[PDB]
Amino acid sequence: LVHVASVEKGRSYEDFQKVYNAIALKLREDDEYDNYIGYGPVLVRLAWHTSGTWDKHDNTGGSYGGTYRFKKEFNDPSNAGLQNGFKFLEPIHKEFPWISSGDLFSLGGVTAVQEMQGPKIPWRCGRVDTPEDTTPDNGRLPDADKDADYVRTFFQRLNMNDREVVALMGAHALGKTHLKRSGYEGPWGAANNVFTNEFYLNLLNEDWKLEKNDANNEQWDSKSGYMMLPTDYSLIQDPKYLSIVKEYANDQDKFFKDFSKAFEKLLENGITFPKDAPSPFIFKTLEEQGL
Numbered sequence: 001l002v003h004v005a006s007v008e009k010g011r012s013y014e015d016f017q018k019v020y021n022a023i024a025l026k027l028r029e030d031d032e033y034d035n036y037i038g039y040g041p042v043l044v045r046l047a048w049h050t051s052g053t054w055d056k057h058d059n060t061g062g063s064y065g066g067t068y069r070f071k072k073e074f075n076d077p078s079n080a081g082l083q084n085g086f087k088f089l090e091p092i093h094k095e096f097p098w099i100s101s102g103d104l105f106s107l108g109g110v111t112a113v114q115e116m117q118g119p120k121i122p123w124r125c126g127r128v129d130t131p132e133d134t135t136p137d138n139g140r141l142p143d144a145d146k147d148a149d150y151v152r153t154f155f156q157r158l159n160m161n162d163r164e165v166v167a168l169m170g171a172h173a174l175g176k177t178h179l180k181r182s183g184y185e186g187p188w189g190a191a192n193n194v195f196t197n198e199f200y201l202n203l204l205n206e207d208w209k210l211e212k213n214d215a216n217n218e219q220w221d222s223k224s225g226y227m228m229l230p231t232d233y234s235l236i237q238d239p240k241y242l243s244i245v246k247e248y249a250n251d252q253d254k255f256f257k258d259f260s261k262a263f264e265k266l267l268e269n270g271i272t273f274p275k276d277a278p279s280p281f282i283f284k285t286l287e288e289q290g291l
């Protein structure tokens with residue numbers, strides 16, 4: 001199965017900047033969600049989970065088809081809580097009914113990262129909705145209770161290398177774990193709706209203790225009130241990952257550049273862009289537009 005990007009008929013950068021802006025304005029307005037964290041983090045996670053079902057071996061799953069809109073995928077236990085990001089996007093889709101579902105879910109993540117003061121993420125249009133029977137089965141998203149070998153092997157299926165994995169995991173600066181959702185509880189740091197390299201700094205500099213949470217699962221906790229999942233902590237247990245964690249903890253711009261590339265790649269696995277497709281779009285933030 002080849003998925004060829006097909007530009008929404010007649011649309012160009014200004015149309016997608018208008019969608020960006022609508023997302024960004026709602027992000028600013030609906031600020032109460034999740035004890036005033038806001039919707040940025042869950043929109044980033046929605047973009048990742050809708051892309052991270054991809055299998056490089058047969059091009060099943062991935063962002064192209066926007067299949068999260070079907071009950072098998074929206075009810076994946078791995079996706080518990082993402083309905084909040086979907087509900088956020090619903091009025092955006094109603095205003096811009098021409099955008100595909102995959103383009104909207106992925107653009108939500110780009111818009112969230114950028115509006116949270118993260119790197120620019122180039123973004124390409126042209127995902128096309130595919131039918132209900134193309135929805136990937138549950139079980140393609142990763143478990144959190146595992147070690148570095150698990151994480152490395154998992155991400156090979158998404159064609160990500162060590163550097164790409166460690167960079168992508170930096171998104172855990174954002175938001176928090178919620179016990180009723182995943183069986184883990186707590187934020188990874190203090191700046192959890194501003195995109196920074198804090199995840200790496202906290203991994204290296206907090207005093208972590210291996211504790212059980214109230215769902216009887218182990219997680220790493222600090223006196224500051226932060227947590228790390230076992231898979232997060234694996235990045236400092238494995239010496240290859242550890243070197244890269246130190247690099248990003250010591251170079252904010254390098255993390256931003258590497259995250260941008262890996263996140264674009266994640267959002268584009270499985271898609272064939274014709275030679276004459278538009279170049280990737282770099283959207284202006286609301287701040288840059290004076291809005």
Ligand code: HEM
Nearest residue numbers: 041042044045048142143144168171175176177178181182
């Ligand atoms: C080994 C890989 C990963 C594992 C096991 C993992 C696991 C988790 C878990 C258990 C949660 C908490 C869900 C909840 O209780 O609300 C979470 C949240 C989150 N993850 Fe991941 N994650 C992984 C990779 C990633 C990647 C690659 C990104 C995106 C680039 C990402 C972005 C997020 C975000 C932004 C949140 C916060 C959501 C919120 O606050 O609602 N994660 N992750």
